[PDB]
Nucleic acid binder design. Structure first.
Ligand SMILES: NC[C@@H]1O[C@H](O[C@H]2[C@@H](O)[C@H](O[C@@H]3[C@@H](O)[C@H](N)C[C@H](N)[C@H]3O[C@H]3O[C@H](CO)[C@@H](O)[C@H](O)[C@H]3N)O[C@@H]2CO)[C@H](N)[C@@H](O)[C@@H]1O
Ligand SMILES: [Mg+2]
Ligand SMILES: [Mg+2]
Ligand SMILES: [Mg+2]
Ligand SMILES: [Mg+2]
Ligand SMILES: [Mg+2]
Ligand SMILES: [Mg+2]
Ligand SMILES: [Mg+2]
Ligand SMILES: [Mg+2]
Ligand SMILES: [Mg+2]
Ligand SMILES: [Mg+2]
Ligand SMILES: [Mg+2]
Ligand SMILES: [Mg+2]
Ligand SMILES: [Mg+2]
Ligand SMILES: [Mg+2]
Ligand SMILES: [Mg+2]
Ligand SMILES: [Mg+2]
Ligand SMILES: [Mg+2]
Ligand SMILES: [Mg+2]
Ligand SMILES: [Mg+2]
Ligand SMILES: [Mg+2]
Ligand SMILES: [Mg+2]
Ligand SMILES: [Mg+2]
Ligand SMILES: [Mg+2]
Ligand SMILES: [Mg+2]
Ligand SMILES: [Mg+2]
Ligand SMILES: [Mg+2]
Ligand SMILES: [Mg+2]
Ligand SMILES: [Mg+2]
Ligand SMILES: [Mg+2]
Ligand SMILES: [Mg+2]
Ligand SMILES: [Mg+2]
Ligand SMILES: [Mg+2]
Ligand SMILES: [Mg+2]
Ligand SMILES: [Mg+2]
Ligand SMILES: [Mg+2]
Ligand SMILES: [Mg+2]
Ligand SMILES: [Mg+2]
Ligand SMILES: [Mg+2]
Ligand SMILES: [Mg+2]
Ligand SMILES: [Mg+2]
Ligand SMILES: [Mg+2]
Ligand SMILES: [Mg+2]
Ligand SMILES: [Mg+2]
Ligand SMILES: [Mg+2]
Ligand SMILES: [Mg+2]
Ligand SMILES: [Mg+2]
Ligand SMILES: [Mg+2]
Ligand SMILES: [Mg+2]
Ligand SMILES: [Mg+2]
Ligand SMILES: [Mg+2]
Ligand SMILES: [Mg+2]
Ligand SMILES: [Mg+2]
Ligand SMILES: [Mg+2]
Ligand SMILES: [Mg+2]
Ligand SMILES: [Mg+2]
Ligand SMILES: [Mg+2]
Ligand SMILES: [Mg+2]
Ligand SMILES: [Mg+2]
Ligand SMILES: [Mg+2]
Ligand SMILES: [Mg+2]
Ligand SMILES: [Mg+2]
Ligand SMILES: [Mg+2]
Ligand SMILES: [Mg+2]
Ligand SMILES: [Mg+2]
Ligand SMILES: [Mg+2]
Ligand SMILES: [Mg+2]
Ligand SMILES: [Mg+2]
Ligand SMILES: [Mg+2]
Ligand SMILES: [Mg+2]
Ligand SMILES: [Mg+2]
Ligand SMILES: [Mg+2]
Ligand SMILES: [Mg+2]
Ligand SMILES: [Mg+2]
Ligand SMILES: [Mg+2]
Ligand SMILES: [Mg+2]
Ligand SMILES: [Mg+2]
Ligand SMILES: [Mg+2]
Ligand SMILES: [Mg+2]
Ligand SMILES: [Mg+2]
Ligand SMILES: [Mg+2]
Ligand SMILES: [Mg+2]
Ligand SMILES: [Mg+2]
Ligand SMILES: [Mg+2]
Ligand SMILES: [Mg+2]
Ligand SMILES: [Mg+2]
Ligand SMILES: [Mg+2]
Ligand SMILES: [Mg+2]
Ligand SMILES: [Mg+2]
Ligand SMILES: [Mg+2]
Ligand SMILES: [Mg+2]
Ligand SMILES: [Mg+2]
Ligand SMILES: [Mg+2]
Ligand SMILES: [Mg+2]
Ligand SMILES: [Mg+2]
Ligand SMILES: [Mg+2]
Ligand SMILES: [Mg+2]
Ligand SMILES: [Mg+2]
Ligand SMILES: [Mg+2]
Ligand SMILES: [Mg+2]
Ligand SMILES: [Mg+2]
Ligand SMILES: [Mg+2]
Ligand SMILES: [Mg+2]
Ligand SMILES: [Mg+2]
Ligand SMILES: [Mg+2]
Ligand SMILES: [Mg+2]
Ligand SMILES: [Mg+2]
Ligand SMILES: [Mg+2]
Ligand SMILES: [Mg+2]
Ligand SMILES: [Mg+2]
Ligand SMILES: [Mg+2]
Ligand SMILES: [Mg+2]
Ligand SMILES: [Mg+2]
Ligand SMILES: [Mg+2]
Ligand SMILES: [Mg+2]
Ligand SMILES: [Mg+2]
Ligand SMILES: [Mg+2]
Ligand SMILES: [Mg+2]
Ligand SMILES: [Mg+2]
Ligand SMILES: [Mg+2]
Ligand SMILES: [Mg+2]
Ligand SMILES: [Mg+2]
Ligand SMILES: [Mg+2]
Ligand SMILES: [Mg+2]
Ligand SMILES: [Mg+2]
Ligand SMILES: [Mg+2]
Ligand SMILES: [Mg+2]
Ligand SMILES: [Mg+2]
Ligand SMILES: [Mg+2]
Ligand SMILES: [Mg+2]
Ligand SMILES: [Mg+2]
Ligand SMILES: [Mg+2]
Ligand SMILES: [Mg+2]
Ligand SMILES: [Mg+2]
Ligand SMILES: [Mg+2]
Ligand SMILES: [Mg+2]
Ligand SMILES: [Mg+2]
Ligand SMILES: [Mg+2]
Ligand SMILES: [Mg+2]
Ligand SMILES: [Mg+2]
Ligand SMILES: [Mg+2]
Ligand SMILES: [Mg+2]
Ligand SMILES: [Mg+2]
Ligand SMILES: [Mg+2]
Ligand SMILES: [Mg+2]
Ligand SMILES: [Mg+2]
Ligand SMILES: [Mg+2]
Ligand SMILES: [Mg+2]
Ligand SMILES: [Mg+2]
Ligand SMILES: [Mg+2]
Ligand SMILES: [Mg+2]
Ligand SMILES: [Mg+2]
Ligand SMILES: [Mg+2]
Ligand SMILES: [Mg+2]
Ligand SMILES: [Mg+2]
Ligand SMILES: [Mg+2]
Lengths: 272, 45
RNA sequence: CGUGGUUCGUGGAGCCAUGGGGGAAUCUGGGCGGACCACCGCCUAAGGCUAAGUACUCCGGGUGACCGAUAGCGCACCAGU
RNA sequence: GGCGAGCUAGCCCUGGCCAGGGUGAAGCUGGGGUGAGACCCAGUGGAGGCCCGAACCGGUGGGGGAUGCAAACCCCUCGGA
RNA sequence: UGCGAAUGCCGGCAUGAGUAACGAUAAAGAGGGUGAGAAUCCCUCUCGCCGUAAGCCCAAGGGUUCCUACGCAAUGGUCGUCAGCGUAGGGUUAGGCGGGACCUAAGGUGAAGCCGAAAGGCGUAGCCGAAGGGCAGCCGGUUAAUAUUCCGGCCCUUCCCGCAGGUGCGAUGGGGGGACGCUCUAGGCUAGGGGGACCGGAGCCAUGGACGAGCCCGGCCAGAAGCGCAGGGUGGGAGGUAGGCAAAUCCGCCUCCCAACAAGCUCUGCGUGGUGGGGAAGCCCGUACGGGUGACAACCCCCCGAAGCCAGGGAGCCAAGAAAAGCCUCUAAGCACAACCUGCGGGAACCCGUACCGCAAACCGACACAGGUGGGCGGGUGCAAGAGCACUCAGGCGCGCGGGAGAACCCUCGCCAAGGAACUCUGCAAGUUGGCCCCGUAACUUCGGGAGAAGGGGUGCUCCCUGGGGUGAUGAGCCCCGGGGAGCCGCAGUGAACAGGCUCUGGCGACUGUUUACCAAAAACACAGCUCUCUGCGAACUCGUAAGAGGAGGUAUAGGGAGCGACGCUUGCCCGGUGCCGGAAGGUCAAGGGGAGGGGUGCAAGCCCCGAACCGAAGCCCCGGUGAACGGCGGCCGUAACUAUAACGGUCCUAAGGUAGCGAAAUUCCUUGUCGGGUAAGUUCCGACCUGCACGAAAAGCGUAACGACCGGAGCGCUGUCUCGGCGAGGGACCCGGUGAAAUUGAACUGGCCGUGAAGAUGCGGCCUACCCGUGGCAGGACGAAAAGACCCCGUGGAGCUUUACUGC
RNA sequence: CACCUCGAUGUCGGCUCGUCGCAUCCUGGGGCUGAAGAAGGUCCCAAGGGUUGGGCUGUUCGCCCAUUAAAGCGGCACGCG
RNA sequence: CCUACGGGCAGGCGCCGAGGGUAGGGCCCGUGACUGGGGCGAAGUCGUAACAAGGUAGCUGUACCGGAAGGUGCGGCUG
RNA sequence: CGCGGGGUGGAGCAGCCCGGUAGCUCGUCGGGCUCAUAACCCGAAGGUCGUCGGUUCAAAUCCGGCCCCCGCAACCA
C-alpha cells in the first residue's frame, strides 16, 4: 500500500512510491474521451504569476466528466481504473450501454465490473451520482456540486469525503473535507462514496529531483534574499524576521485572514 | 568565447525588419525618423 | 459634493467649465454685475456656420558693417555616406 | 518617449546526445521453513539525482600569461558524466 | 578682435628605438624549374606532425572568397614570381535533393466578441508558424569550375484527358488511423572490418639466407518484377442500438456464431536478381592535376558485427509520455447520360536554393586572433574493454620572418650523492600510488555501506598436455574463454603511452545538485522532510487601469505565503508591550441624517448663511486568546562541627527570570585559561573542567552512518619544498639580415657627501669625486609609470537600502 | 602638532641582499673586587670579524627543545613588494 | 678428487624450515586529565517520605516532574 | 579618560523627584504557648543616611569636589 525501497542509494532510503494495483490493465489512457493536448505554461500572458513552476514530465489531459446528470437513467459498466497524472485521484473509465465512454474520478470501492448510474432514481451504492436532496442523511459522498448544474467542485482529491449532516429548506448541510460546515443547494449532484486512492497522502518524494518530475522548481526563502526582493532580506549572517513574517508582497503571512468578507456566499457557510 | 553577435537571418528580419517596424506605432516612428534623416536604409538587410 | 480654468495656492471666492447627487421654468421667463439680500442695471445658456487682419518655412526670389573649407549646415567634394 | 532576451537568466514547442567498464535493489524461479506464515539460501534478474571513465558539461589547486595568442587565454591537476 | 598652459579640441611630427615583438617548440634539408629579383612560388626526393583529426559529408552564418588568364602598389607581421590581393573572363542546370503552390506545434495574428482618455490591450473560429508530421532517385560517367541537377542505365509520383472494367458515388462533416515516454532488451539481418593455402595482378630476390603454398596489390557497387528469408500490422459473420451534437451500412456498446491462429490477408526489412558500372600495386607519360597500361583483371570462401534496419518488436517502471493533414472507412446535401475505384495509354509537371569556406585565413571574437561554434562518417595493430592511449591508413599538414650563437637571467622540461618537511602561512609545488587477475580487509553503520578500506602476490616469452563455448556437419578451419606442466632471458615483463598515495582524528553541511559570466564554489542556495498560516472555489494569491490571464481545465490527501532543513532523541517558562485572532456591550469617530437656537437683507411674503442636542461605519480605545507569531527568559546577602564550598534561607525586582542538552566553542574579552594527550620542544590540534565578557532548543538544541576539488590537526610512504646547490635539454634572452610598436615625455649640458630649503635636492651651499660615447646586465633613486585616492573629511552633491522619520500614492 | 605629499609617498610579517651605529652578546686588552686557584661580579677600552638548528603562532616579540665562544640591541620611509 | 667408473665424494639448484621483517585483526592485564554511582566512617546541613488512616492507606510496573526524600497521571495488588 | 545609575539600622530594599516626617520585610532582644525546639502570638530595642564642603531659616533630600559600587561605550585604523 505504498512501495518502499531498500537504501541502495541515499534518497532511495526514505523515498516511497504509489501502489498501482487498483490500476486495471492500463497504460494507453484511451484517446477519444481524452486525451487532449495540455498546455503546460507557468505564467499568464507574459509574466510569471505563480512562482517556482515548470519543467516536469510532459502530460496528456484526461477530459473527465464532472456533471454526471448529463446521462440520467443510462447505466454504465466500469471497464478500467487508470492512472491520471493531472489529479491526486485515479480515474475509472466507464462504458455506457448508450455506447458512450467517459471518465469518472474513481471512488474508493468501485471494482471493475459494477453497473453505475446517475439520477434521482438510482440505487445508493458506491459510484452512483444523485442529487443531494435524494441522498439520505449521514452518507459520505464526493465530487459535489456547489450550485446546481455548475459542475462537481468539492471533495475530488484522493481520499476526500463530505458527510451530509442535515437538510434545511431547498438546501442540505455538508461537512466538507476542510471541516467547514456548508449549506449546499438540494439539487446539486453529489456522488456516493469517498474518493479513494487514499494512501496518496503518505508518499514521500525522496530526493530533490522527484519534486521536479512533479513540475515544482526550487523555492527560495525570503530569508535568503536581499531587501530589494523580499521583506526578509538582510542582516549579515542570518537575522530573525525582525518584523511580523511576510510574503514577498508585504502582507503578513501568519494568521492574517484573507477571505473577502462581503462575499454573498458567507450567508451559506458555518465553520473552519 | 561565445561573443554577443550570433547572427541568424530569420531573427534579424523577424526583429528589426520592415514588416515588424510597422505594427508597433513606436517603430512606424523609427521609420518616420529614419526617412526624414534620409537614411539610405530604413531597416537592416 | 469632487475638481479644472481665470491674477485667485480655500481665501469674503464670484464667474466659466463638470465626474457624482437632486433637479426647474418659457417674457410676469432666465443668466449676470466677486459670499448673501434689496435696489438699479447688463445680457438672452443648454444647436450651427462665417472670409480678412494672425502663426509657420520643406519650398522660390531679394538683400547682408553674415561665414570663407578647424569657418559656414553634420555634408562647397557621389553624406546622413 | 522609445530600442534591446541573436549575450545572459527562466519558462514554453519541437528535435538531438551520453565510448567502455563496474556494483547487483525489487520481482521471478527453485530449494529449505511453517498449521498456514514471516523469513532463509541459491539462481535469475537489471534497479539507482549508484560507482570507475572518454565524449560532452564544468572551473578545484597551481604555474605561465598581464602594451597577452586572448578586454578571462594556455599548461599540469581537478568536479559531474 | 590678440593664447602657452584648461589631464583643453582638431591636425602634424617627434621620444622611447632600430628597442619589445613578427601570434603555439608538429621540423626541416637538398636538387631542379621559373624570374629583373627566390630560405618563402612550382616540381622531385628525404625528414617530421595530425589521424574520434589537424581527414570527410551536412546545418548555420558568410556572399565571388570558386575556376582560368594577366599582375604585385597596397593587404600578407619577412620575402613574394605566390595568395583568400588587383584587372578581366568564365562557372551554380532538378516533376524525385531542401523549401514553397500540404499539415499542424509553442507562439503569433485574428471575422464574432470584450476592454481601454488616444496610442492601444485581450480574444472563439480561422489564418500564419518547423529540424516535428506527410511526400515520388539510386548508381556510374563527364567539367578548368555543377551535378541524386547534365549524360547513361534501371526505377518512380502527381495532375489532365481517353479507353476499358468495377461501385451508390459524393465531405471543410462522423469514425479509424496517423499517435508517440524512460531503462533494459530477443531473433534475424545490413553497414563496417579481419583472414584465406583459393581467384586476378605488373614486377621483385638486394646485404648473410629465401625461387618459396615467398614478397608486394586487389578480390566489389547500384539494381525493378518474381522468389525466398525475418519481422511489424490485423480477427471473420450475424443480429439489437437510444452514443459518436444532421445522416450513416462507419465507430461505440450488448447478444449470439464461427477462428484464436498471425492460418489468412497486408506492410516493411534483408537476399537473389535482369541490366548497368566500377575495378590495386607497379611501371610510363610531362603536369601546375591527372591520364595510359596493368585487364578480356579477378569480383570467391571463412570469420568478427553494430548503438543501424525489420519497428508500431518485447519486458520492466512511474514521473504516465504533441497536434493536424496525407491515408481509410461512413454517410449529408448534390448528382446518379454524373462521380469515384482499378488497369492500361497518351499528354502535362511551376517558383526559390544548388559556386565556394564551413572547428575555420572565407562563420562569432577591430587581426590570416593558441578563444567559441550544432548533426553525421570517422580504417588498422596492440593494450581487458573503449570514441581511451601509442603508432599508423586514406586524407591533410610543418601553423607566412629567417640565419647563427650556447652568457646572466626567465619559461617548459630531465637527473641527482647523504638526508627526507629540517621548507613554508600550509608538503604549496612536485613526487609517490597507479591497468588487470588473485589473496585479503578494521572501527563504525541508517545493514546499503565503510570498500579500490588497509596490506600483499601474480603479469613476458618457449615447448608439451588439456576443458568449454559460437560457427560450421557431430569435423576441420575460424573466433571466443580458459586449465595444467617443464623451461628461457633481462636491472626490469600493464618493460613504451594513457591508469588512486595511504591511515588516524575534529569543525560545518546529511546526501546528487546550485552560485558572485570575469578575484569568493563555500559552512552560502536549493534539497527531500517537519511546523505554522491563509484558501469553499467567480478560492486565496500574483500580473493588468480594464477585459482578461496565471492559480487550474486544479478543489483542502488541493493551492498560496512563512520558517526550519535526511534521520535519531528533543524542542521547556513569560501573552505585560508589538503582530494576528476572537468580542452583536461600552467610549470615542467622518460624511450624511437631524434640526433646538442664532444671524444677513427685505416694508412683508420671503430669500440666503451659521448651528446644539440627538441617530451614523470602519479604525482606535477597551475585554480576551495566541510562542515552529515580533520577541524576552534577574540582583544582593547569609548558611554546614578544619577549611573551602553551599543542598538550605533572607530580601529586592519581573510579563517571566534559561529546562534538556552543550560549553575557552565558526561563540571565551581576560587568554598562549587550567589539567591531561600528542611532540626532543605544540598560541594550533584532541580530551577534559565551567569562571558561558557575550551557548541553548524550527534565525532550532544535541548527536549521527554515508557523502565533500569545503576548513583544522597527526602519522606512514615519497620527494629539489628544504640542508644546498650542481649538471643537462629545448623555447626566449645575445649577435646578423628583413619588417618594426608602446605606455611616458616642461625643457636638460640629469654625479657623491654633509648641510640647507614647503620639513626626504642631479637643479641652492660648502667640500669630494669625475676624459667623450656605447653595449649587456641589477632594480636603490628620479617622493619612477598608470588611475583628478577607492581610505579620511568636506558639499545645505548623488544614488541603493531600512523604519513605530515626515508627507503622500 | 597637522609642515611637503589625497591629478596616490602600497600598510604588518616573512624571504633575498645588505650596509651602518656602539649604548659590546662573543672573542682581544684592561682597572676595581667582599678576586686563594678555577669560575664570577662590576666598570673602562675595542665595531676587526662572528653572532646556530628546531617546536608553537601570520606574527615582529616571546615561550620552549638541542646546542654554543656568543645565540647583542638598534638605524637605514618600523632598510628592502 | 678417489675408484674396486654404468660408483662414491666434493660441489650446485630445489622443497620444507628456527626465526627476522612488513601488514592488519582478536583476547586479557596494567595504567589516565576527568567523570558515574557505591560501601564505610559517635554526636555536621535541609526537610518528614515510611512505621499508628503516619496525619494524602501503602506498595507496584510505567511515565512526566521536583534541592532531597518524593508528587502526580494510568492501570494493578492488599501485604 | 567618556556617559548613566547608585552608597539609608545587622541583611535586602523604600524614602531623595516636590526641603521640614526617616518607612517595609527579615533578623536581633524581652515575654508567652511547648516536656523542649521550631512555627505561632504579645512587646521592644537599633540608623545620622560614604565623606569634605556650599545654599537655605532648615539638607537623607538642592549644589560642587574627593571616595567607592555597578552598568554602558571605546568606532573609521
Ligand atoms: N550507608 C548508608 C547508605 O548510604 C546513605 O547513607 C549515607 C549518608 O546519607 C549518611 O549521612 C548521614 C546523614 O544522613 C545524617 N542525616 C547526618 C549524619 N551525620 C550523616 O552521617 C555521616 O556523618 C559523619 C560525618 O560528620 C560520619 O562520621 C558518619 O559516619 C556518617 N554517617 O551517611 C551515610 C554514609 O556514611 C543512605 N543514607 C542509605 O540510603 C544507604 O543505605
Ligand atoms: Mg527553501
Ligand atoms: Mg544574501
Ligand atoms: Mg530588480
Ligand atoms: Mg523585481
Ligand atoms: Mg522591503
Ligand atoms: Mg530581516
Ligand atoms: Mg548575527
Ligand atoms: Mg558552449
Ligand atoms: Mg557587427
Ligand atoms: Mg563587437
Ligand atoms: Mg531558421
Ligand atoms: Mg540614393
Ligand atoms: Mg496657502
Ligand atoms: Mg453636473
Ligand atoms: Mg428679470
Ligand atoms: Mg456681467
Ligand atoms: Mg455686487
Ligand atoms: Mg451682461
Ligand atoms: Mg441662439
Ligand atoms: Mg475658421
Ligand atoms: Mg530660403
Ligand atoms: Mg578642409
Ligand atoms: Mg566643415
Ligand atoms: Mg538646408
Ligand atoms: Mg564638420
Ligand atoms: Mg554627396
Ligand atoms: Mg535566449
Ligand atoms: Mg557524436
Ligand atoms: Mg551517477
Ligand atoms: Mg561521485
Ligand atoms: Mg584553475
Ligand atoms: Mg573560482
Ligand atoms: Mg588559475
Ligand atoms: Mg593564475
Ligand atoms: Mg582523474
Ligand atoms: Mg574529467
Ligand atoms: Mg566519474
Ligand atoms: Mg597655439
Ligand atoms: Mg596664460
Ligand atoms: Mg600651441
Ligand atoms: Mg590628412
Ligand atoms: Mg632599452
Ligand atoms: Mg634587449
Ligand atoms: Mg627579439
Ligand atoms: Mg608563425
Ligand atoms: Mg575540402
Ligand atoms: Mg573580390
Ligand atoms: Mg599566376
Ligand atoms: Mg604586393
Ligand atoms: Mg610584404
Ligand atoms: Mg599578422
Ligand atoms: Mg583561388
Ligand atoms: Mg583574384
Ligand atoms: Mg544537398
Ligand atoms: Mg495551381
Ligand atoms: Mg495552417
Ligand atoms: Mg493581439
Ligand atoms: Mg502553412
Ligand atoms: Mg520533414
Ligand atoms: Mg521531396
Ligand atoms: Mg557521381
Ligand atoms: Mg567542387
Ligand atoms: Mg461509399
Ligand atoms: Mg558489402
Ligand atoms: Mg561484408
Ligand atoms: Mg598477364
Ligand atoms: Mg645475398
Ligand atoms: Mg615463381
Ligand atoms: Mg578482403
Ligand atoms: Mg467481433
Ligand atoms: Mg535489395
Ligand atoms: Mg526484390
Ligand atoms: Mg562488366
Ligand atoms: Mg602532387
Ligand atoms: Mg512496444
Ligand atoms: Mg485544418
Ligand atoms: Mg479520394
Ligand atoms: Mg551543386
Ligand atoms: Mg558543393
Ligand atoms: Mg568542404
Ligand atoms: Mg564537426
Ligand atoms: Mg580554409
Ligand atoms: Mg579543413
Ligand atoms: Mg576571423
Ligand atoms: Mg597565421
Ligand atoms: Mg582561430
Ligand atoms: Mg586498456
Ligand atoms: Mg587520441
Ligand atoms: Mg604520429
Ligand atoms: Mg601522406
Ligand atoms: Mg637527493
Ligand atoms: Mg639516494
Ligand atoms: Mg623515509
Ligand atoms: Mg616547520
Ligand atoms: Mg623555519
Ligand atoms: Mg599537492
Ligand atoms: Mg600521473
Ligand atoms: Mg571515516
Ligand atoms: Mg603482449
Ligand atoms: Mg622476451
Ligand atoms: Mg569447431
Ligand atoms: Mg583511478
Ligand atoms: Mg575520484
Ligand atoms: Mg553540502
Ligand atoms: Mg556556472
Ligand atoms: Mg567569480
Ligand atoms: Mg481563470
Ligand atoms: Mg486551466
Ligand atoms: Mg536554514
Ligand atoms: Mg521555543
Ligand atoms: Mg508577550
Ligand atoms: Mg494578552
Ligand atoms: Mg499580545
Ligand atoms: Mg563529627
Ligand atoms: Mg559567547
Ligand atoms: Mg608530555
Ligand atoms: Mg588558524
Ligand atoms: Mg545566556
Ligand atoms: Mg545560536
Ligand atoms: Mg527561535
Ligand atoms: Mg541547523
Ligand atoms: Mg554540534
Ligand atoms: Mg558536491
Ligand atoms: Mg566541497
Ligand atoms: Mg631546484
Ligand atoms: Mg656618466
Ligand atoms: Mg638633503
Ligand atoms: Mg645661490
Ligand atoms: Mg649640490
Ligand atoms: Mg645600460
Ligand atoms: Mg631602480
Ligand atoms: Mg627588470
Ligand atoms: Mg607614482
Ligand atoms: Mg581628488
Ligand atoms: Mg542631500
Ligand atoms: Mg598639512
Ligand atoms: Mg595651523
Ligand atoms: Mg604626480
Ligand atoms: Mg665603549
Ligand atoms: Mg605552524
Ligand atoms: Mg641590522
Ligand atoms: Mg616609526
Ligand atoms: Mg618597512
Ligand atoms: Mg564521587
Ligand atoms: Mg505517601
Ligand atoms: Mg510522614
Ligand atoms: Mg501518608
Ligand atoms: Mg506511581
Ligand atoms: Mg531550589
Ligand atoms: Mg493509583
Ligand atoms: Mg545595608
Ligand atoms: Mg519579626
Ligand atoms: Mg522570642
Ligand atoms: Mg551638610
Ligand atoms: Mg564605519
Amino acid at each position: 500500500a505504498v512501495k518502499k525501497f531498500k537504501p541502495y542509494t541515499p534518497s532511495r532510503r526514505f523515498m516511497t512510491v504509489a501502489d498501482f494495483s487498483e490500476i486495471t490493465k492500463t497504460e494507453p489512457e484511451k484517446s477519444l474521451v481524452k486525451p487532449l493536448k495540455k498546455t503546460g505554461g507557468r505564467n499568464n500572458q507574459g509574466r510569471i504569476t505563480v512562482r517556482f513552476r515548470g519543467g516536469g514530465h510532459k502530460r496528456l489531459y484526461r477530459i473527465i466528466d464532472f456533471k454526471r446528470w448529463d446521462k440520467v437513467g443510462i447505466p454504465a459498466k466500469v471497464a478500467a481504473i487508470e492512472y491520471d497524472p493531472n489529479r491526486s485521484a485515479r480515474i475509472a473509465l466507464l462504458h455506457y450501454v448508450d455506447g458512450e465512454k467517459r471518465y469518472i474520478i474513481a471512488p474508493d470501492g468501485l471494482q471493475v465490473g459494477q453497473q453505475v448510474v446517475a439520477g434521482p432514481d438510482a440505487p445508493i451504492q458506491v459510484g452512483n451520482a444523485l442529487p443531494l436532496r435524494f441522498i439520505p442523511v449521514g452518507t459520505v459522498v464526493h465530487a459535489v456540486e456547489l450550485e446546481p448544474k455548475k459542475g462537481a467542485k468539492l471533495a475530488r482529491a484522493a481520499g476526500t469525503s463530505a458527510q451530509i449532516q442535515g437538510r434545511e429548506g431547498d438546501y442540505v448541510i455538508l461537512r466538507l473535507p476542510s471541516g467547514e460546515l456548508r449549506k449546499v443547494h438540494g439539487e446539486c449532484y453529489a456522488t456516493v462514496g469517498a474518493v479513494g486512492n487514499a494512501d496518496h497522502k503518505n508518499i514521500v518524494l525522496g530526493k530533490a529531483g522527484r519534486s521536479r518530475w512533479l513540475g515544482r522548481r526550487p523555492h527560495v526563502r525570503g530569508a535568503a534574499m536581499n531587501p530589494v526582493d523580499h521583506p526578509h532580506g538582510g542582516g549579515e549572517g542570518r537575522a530573525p524576521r525582525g518584523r511580523p513574517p511576510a510574503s514577498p508582497w508585504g502582507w503578513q503571512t501568519k494568521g492574517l485572514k484573507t477571505r473577502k468578507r462581503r462575499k454573498p456566499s458567507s450567508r451559506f457557510i458555518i465553520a473552519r | 568565447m561565445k561573443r554577443t553577435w550570433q547572427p541568424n537571418r530569420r531573427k534579424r528580419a523577424k526583429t528589426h525588419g520592415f514588416r515588424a517596424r510597422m505594427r508597433t506605432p513606436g517603430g512606424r516612428k523609427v521609420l518616420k525618423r529614419r526617412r526624414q534623416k534620409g537614411r539610405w536604409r530604413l531597416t537592416p538587410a
